[PDB]
Design a protein around this motif. Structure first.
Motif, PDB file in Angstrom:
ATOM      1  N   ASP A 130       0.930  -1.121   0.208  1.00  0.00           N
ATOM      2  CA  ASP A 130      -0.057   0.138   0.073  1.00  0.00           C
ATOM      3  C   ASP A 130       0.872   1.320  -0.037  1.00  0.00           C
ATOM      4  N   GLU A 329      -0.658  11.353   1.774  1.00  0.00           N
ATOM      5  CA  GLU A 329      -1.254  11.194   3.470  1.00  0.00           C
ATOM      6  C   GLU A 329      -0.284  11.481   4.271  1.00  0.00           C
ATOM      7  N   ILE A 377      -7.992  -1.862   7.728  1.00  0.00           N
ATOM      8  CA  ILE A 377      -8.153  -2.606   6.428  1.00  0.00           C
ATOM      9  C   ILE A 377      -8.198  -3.987   6.465  1.00  0.00           C
ATOM     10  N   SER A 404      -5.492  -5.241   8.916  1.00  0.00           N
ATOM     11  CA  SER A 404      -4.513  -4.450   8.986  1.00  0.00           C
ATOM     12  C   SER A 404      -5.114  -3.327   9.811  1.00  0.00           C
ATOM     13  N   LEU A 406      -4.383   0.037  11.729  1.00  0.00           N
ATOM     14  CA  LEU A 406      -3.343   0.731  11.801  1.00  0.00           C
ATOM     15  C   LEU A 406      -3.468   1.841  12.763  1.00  0.00           C
TER      16      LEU A 406
HETATM   17  C1  LIG Z   1       0.888  -2.246   7.012  1.00  0.00           C
HETATM   18  C2  LIG Z   1      -0.130  -2.923   5.943  1.00  0.00           C
HETATM   19  C3  LIG Z   1      -0.795  -1.757   5.207  1.00  0.00           C
HETATM   20  C4  LIG Z   1      -0.961  -0.478   5.424  1.00  0.00           C
HETATM   21  N1  LIG Z   1      -1.663   0.008   4.544  1.00  0.00           N
HETATM   22  C5  LIG Z   1      -2.165   1.609   4.395  1.00  0.00           C
HETATM   23  N2  LIG Z   1      -3.056   1.840   3.427  1.00  0.00           N
HETATM   24  C6  LIG Z   1      -3.320   3.170   3.211  1.00  0.00           C
HETATM   25  N3  LIG Z   1      -3.055   4.065   3.976  1.00  0.00           N
HETATM   26  C7  LIG Z   1      -2.111   3.901   4.927  1.00  0.00           C
HETATM   27  N4  LIG Z   1      -1.468   4.850   6.106  1.00  0.00           N
HETATM   28  C8  LIG Z   1      -0.673   4.074   6.615  1.00  0.00           C
HETATM   29  N5  LIG Z   1      -0.838   2.518   6.332  1.00  0.00           N
HETATM   30  C9  LIG Z   1      -1.751   2.567   5.071  1.00  0.00           C
HETATM   31  C10 LIG Z   1       0.160  -4.276   5.790  1.00  0.00           C
HETATM   32  O1  LIG Z   1      -1.361  -4.482   5.493  1.00  0.00           O
END
Ligand SMILES: C/C(=C\CNc1ncnc2[nH]cnc12)CO
Ligand SMILES: *Cc1cc2c(cc1C)nc1c(=O)[nH]c(=O)nc-1n2C[C@H](O)[C@H](O)[C@H](O)COP(=O)(O)OP(=O)(O)OC[C@H]1O[C@@H](n2cnc3c(N)ncnc32)[C@H](O)[C@@H]1O
Ligand SMILES: *[C@@H]1O[C@H](CO)[C@@H](O[C@@H]2O[C@H](CO)[C@@H](O)[C@H](O)[C@H]2NC(C)=O)[C@H](O)[C@H]1NC(C)=O
Ligand SMILES: *[C@@H]1O[C@H](CO)[C@@H](O)[C@H](O)[C@H]1NC(C)=O
Ligand SMILES: *[C@@H]1O[C@H](CO)[C@@H](O)[C@H](O)[C@H]1NC(C)=O
Ligand SMILES: *[C@@H]1O[C@H](CO)[C@@H](O)[C@H](O)[C@H]1NC(C)=O
Length: 479
Positions: A130, A329, A377, A404, A406
């Motif tokens: 990502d 972002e 996610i 995930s 986060l």
């Molecule tokens: C660490 C992982 C995904 C992170 N995906 C993200 N996807 C979208 N924005 C973000 N901002 C920080 N991490 C993300 C593994 O699935």
């Protein structure tokens, strides 16, 4: 041999910089930091480590330190500043093949640079993460997952060959055809067996653009069924990328706006929808189609789905802009000082048969009534696209979900307790999850992670390739 040449640094600034990571939760000072100008310097270090009785130092390979819990630390040891390998202008650390069917990339190189070099030759890797500011060696030591993985497998399923320097200090080229044991061990191998100095990455003709959609649900069963529909084998369906996200009621408007996808008007519509249905949780599928023809293809796919009518949201962007979406972002959040914060992230793979149970206990349960900051996610993966002979550990079912959570952080202690509570719920429910990007702290947890057969193989490879147990000690498997 190295220190006099300025490569092995022991000064406070060097050690401090290699003592923290993205997680911003744990810290560990190394004795020294190597800044190698070439792979020869790494061979020199590892050869010295191998040949010296009473060699004092564990050795870690810092990619960009995106680890969450100290995986890239070498407490009282040597951290290799891998980025140093890419300092010199020549020779190049990224080579697209003459026929454009693969790209050779230095282990230290970040995926954003791999993309840029590939696109210059009209091609691109098929399987991503990502977030693109991660190293080739770093993601390949874990798995490397994103929305393409359902159909192409993780990044470890898209490697043709690698150059690895083992714990014996031997430079070895490995693939399925040569030194396959090392090849398999290193992929998802958590830096335990050697350092990837080069990886050969599969590419495909680069798409120019992506039709980019978000679909809104209040019903988890419909949300997850549709995700599984989009990612089911037929060969796969038309979608290039499939992910999803969860939005808890308390922070619904905030979290929706934080995606960067929905306009304020879009957010208001979804909040109103959730309100009328008294929904505690909202779900969104995120999908793309890489390419009037797109219009009909998209309409055909969407017609198979059961999202709330009126709640399909569309963007159309350049392929590269979609892939690097998270960079924007980071830039925005860093300006507000909200990027460089503690990240008590919870990542796991949850078997399909228990994903509804997980939703009930976690999304509809534990997480309710909290202010969530950061994406949650959730999306299905196909086990068929994973090589179980590789070190990476996945659930046993044909379909399992990437989960995930986060969290960005008195908030830290609360979130750490919350994550313990989620794991406790999973254990008590008998959910056979596998963690991802997490390090365990005792033998039994690690044996459980890999399972008996894969653990025994992992140990066999450790004895063969890192018998002194020096490499990546921050994983806490053999250290
Ligand atoms: C660490 C992982 C995904 C992170 N995906 C993200 N996807 C979208 N924005 C973000 N901002 C920080 N991490 C993300 C593994 O699935
Ligand atoms: C920071 C972060 C991480 C992240 C992400 C988004 C953010 C903002 N999105 C991801 C995603 O969508 N999909 C995915 O699979 N992972 C995602 N990540 C997690 C990321 O993959 C990990 O942080 C991973 O470690 C890569 O990060 P980095 O390249 O910075 O590597 P590191 O943290 O310094 O090191 C991790 C371990 O691997 C060993 N290592 C590093 N390089 C090598 C080489 N070349 N050879 C052998 N081992 C290596 C380290 O020793 C350490 O143990
Ligand atoms: C990319 O290709 C170039 C060849 O043009 C490689 O450069 C050579 O690297 C070796 C060993 O690293 C050196 O001994 C040679 O002097 C280099 N040749 C040239 C022409 O500069 C480079 O290693 C490749 N990069 C990767 C990561 O595979
Ligand atoms: C986390 O980051 C802050 C800066 O915001 C820093 O002061 C602190 O030492 C870091 N903690 C760890 C353990 O990395
Ligand atoms: C590793 O050490 C052994 C001695 O224990 C030696 O025979 C071997 O040649 C060494 N390999 C390298 C590349 O340093
Ligand atoms: C959603 O949260 C708000 C408080 O932020 C609350 O007023 C409302 O009752 C909640 N809705 C539901 C159905 O739980």
């Amino acid at each position: 041999a190295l220190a006099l040449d300025g490569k092995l640094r022991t000064d406070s600034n060097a050690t401090a910089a290699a003592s923290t990571d993205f997680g911003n939760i744990t810290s560990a000072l190394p004795a020294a930091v190597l800044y190698p100008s070439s792979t020869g310097d790494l061979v020199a270090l590892l050869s010295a480590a191998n040949s010296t009785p009473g060699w004092p130092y564990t050795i870690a390979f810092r990619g960009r330190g995106h680890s969450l819990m100290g995986q890239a630390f070498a407490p009282g040891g040597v951290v290799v500043n891998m980025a140093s390998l890419g300092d010199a202008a020549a020779p190049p650390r990224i080579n697209v093949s003459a026929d454009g069917r693969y790209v050779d990339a230095g282990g230290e190189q970040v995926w954003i640079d791999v993309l840029r070099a590939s696109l210059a030759r009209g091609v691109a890797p098929r399987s991503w993460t990502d977030y693109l500011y991660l190293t080739v060696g770093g993601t390949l030591s874990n798995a490397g997952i994103s929305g393409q993985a359902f159909r192409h497998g993780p990044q470890i399923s898209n490697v043709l060959e690698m150059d690895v320097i083992t714990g014996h200090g031997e430079m070895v080229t490995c693939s399925k055809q040569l030194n396959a044991d090392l090849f398999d061990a290193v992929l998802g191998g958590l830096g335990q067996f050697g350092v990837i100095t080069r990886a050969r990455i599969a590419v495909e003709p680069a798409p120019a653009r992506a039709r980019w959609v978000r679909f809104v649900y209040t019903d988890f069963a419909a949300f997850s069924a549709d995700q599984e529909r989009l990612t089911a084998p037929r060969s796969f369906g038309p979608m290039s990328y499939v992910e999803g996200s969860v939005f808890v009621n308390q922070s619904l408007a905030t979290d929706l706006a934080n995606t960067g996808f929905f306009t304020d008007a879009d957010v208001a519509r979804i909040v109103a929808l959730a309100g009328e249905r008294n929904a505690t949780t909202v779900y969104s599928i995120e999908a793309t189609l890489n390419y009037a023809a797109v219009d009909q293809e998209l309409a055909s796919v969407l017609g198979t789905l059961s999202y709330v009518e009126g709640f399909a949201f569309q963007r159309d962007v350049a392929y590269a802009a979609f892939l690097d979406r998270v960079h924007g972002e980071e830039v925005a959040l860093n300006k507000l000082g909200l990027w460089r914060v503690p990240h008590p992230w919870l990542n796991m793979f949850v078997p399909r048969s228990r994903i509804a149970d997980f939703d009930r206990g976690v999304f509809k349960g534990i997480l309710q009534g909290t202010d969530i900051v950061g994406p949650l996610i959730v999306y299905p993966l196909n086990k068929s696209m994973w090589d179980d002979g590789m070190s990476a550990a996945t659930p046993s079912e044909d379909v399992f979900y990437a989960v995930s959570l986060l969290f960005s952080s008195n908030d830290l202690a609360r979130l750490q307790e919350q994550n313990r509570r989620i794991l406790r719920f999973c254990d008590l429910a008998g959910i056979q999850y596998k963690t991802y990007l997490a390090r365990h702290t005792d033998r039994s947890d690690w044996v459980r992670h890999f399972g008996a057969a894969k653990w025994n193989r992992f140990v066999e490879m450790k004895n063969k390739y890192d018998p002194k147990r020096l490499l990546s000690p921050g994983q806490d498997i053999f250290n």
